[PDB]
Design a protein around this ligand. Structure first.
Ligand code: CL
Ligand code: CL
Ligand code: CL
Ligand code: CL
Ligand code: CL
Ligand code: CL
Ligand code: CL
Ligand code: CL
Length: 246
């Protein structure tokens, strides 16, 4: 129980991530199926909640979102932009420390930068802190471990997926039909669906029509992957008519 090898095979993993080992990509040989499988064993509920179709849809949504975060695709890329997931393992621009001091719980270590790392492009002291505590890693003091070890990389992404950050539910709860939207969520058009997941991850900079291009890219990866798993993507897939969470 908690081994996802029966739900997603090695062959499906590398077909999804068709171009991640290409010359045009940057984390060649870094993200492996073995690493993903190992990481997932640490979050037993992930990919093991609901019936077969639900389990597959969770994996499709997780890869849809992380593919976008790490994408190196472009219009006219070989086999389509939605085949270029996992091309990066961290932010290109590493100049910003990403240290937030408002309502500070999580100390920034001097000379350390909390730019995007790993499949979810985990950023900011207020993510590295609780993630490191939950995983037993000193991620604040050494945030580069999240991009030097593929299992750790995946564990940071799955941690993010599984962890609610009020008022946002976990991505896991949304995709497994466990999230009960508040009446504010409903009046805001945040209905359960992949669109809310986009909203959780980066809604402030993308949803309500703020960046249609990025949202469309998230959706293209997701629908491709759903087609490969033979599951239905569902409704409320877009977030252009949703207010961001805050
Ligand atoms: Cl699991
Ligand atoms: Cl492998
Ligand atoms: Cl596409
Ligand atoms: Cl650093
Ligand atoms: Cl949008
Ligand atoms: Cl289905
Ligand atoms: Cl559908
Ligand atoms: Cl919407």
């Amino acid at each position: 129980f908690g081994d996802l090898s029966g739900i997603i095979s090695r062959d499906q993993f590398y077909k999804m991530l068709k171009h991640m080992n290409d010359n045009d990509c940057h984390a060649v040989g870094f993200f492996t199926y073995d690493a993903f499988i190992t990481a997932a064993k640490s979050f037993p509920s992930f990919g093991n909640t609901g019936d077969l179709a639900m389990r597959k849809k969770e994996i499709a949504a997780f890869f849809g979102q992380t593919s976008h975060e790490t994408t190196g695709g472009w219009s006219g890329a070989p086999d389509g932009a939605n085949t270029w997931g996992y091309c990066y393992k961290e932010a290109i621009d590493k100049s910003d420390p990403h240290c937030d001091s408002n309502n500070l719980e999580w100390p920034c270590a001097p000379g350390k930068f909390y730019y995007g790392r790993g499949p979810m492009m985990l950023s900011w002291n207020y993510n590295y802190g609780p993630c490191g505590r939950d995983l037993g890693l000193e991620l604040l003091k050494n945030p580069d471990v999240a991009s030097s070890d593929p299992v750790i990389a995946f564990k940071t992404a799955i941690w993010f997926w599984m962890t609610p950050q009020a008022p946002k539910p976990s991505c896991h709860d949304v995709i497994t039909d466990q999230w009960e939207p508040s009446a504010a969520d409903i009046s805001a058009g945040r209905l359960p669906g992949y669109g809310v997941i986009t909203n959780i991850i980066n809604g402030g900079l993308e949803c309500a029509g703020r960046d249609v291009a990025k949202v469309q890219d998230r959706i293209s990866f997701y629908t491709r992957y759903c087609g490969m798993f033979g599951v239905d993507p569902g409704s409320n897939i877009d977030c252009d008519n949703q207010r961001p969470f805050n």
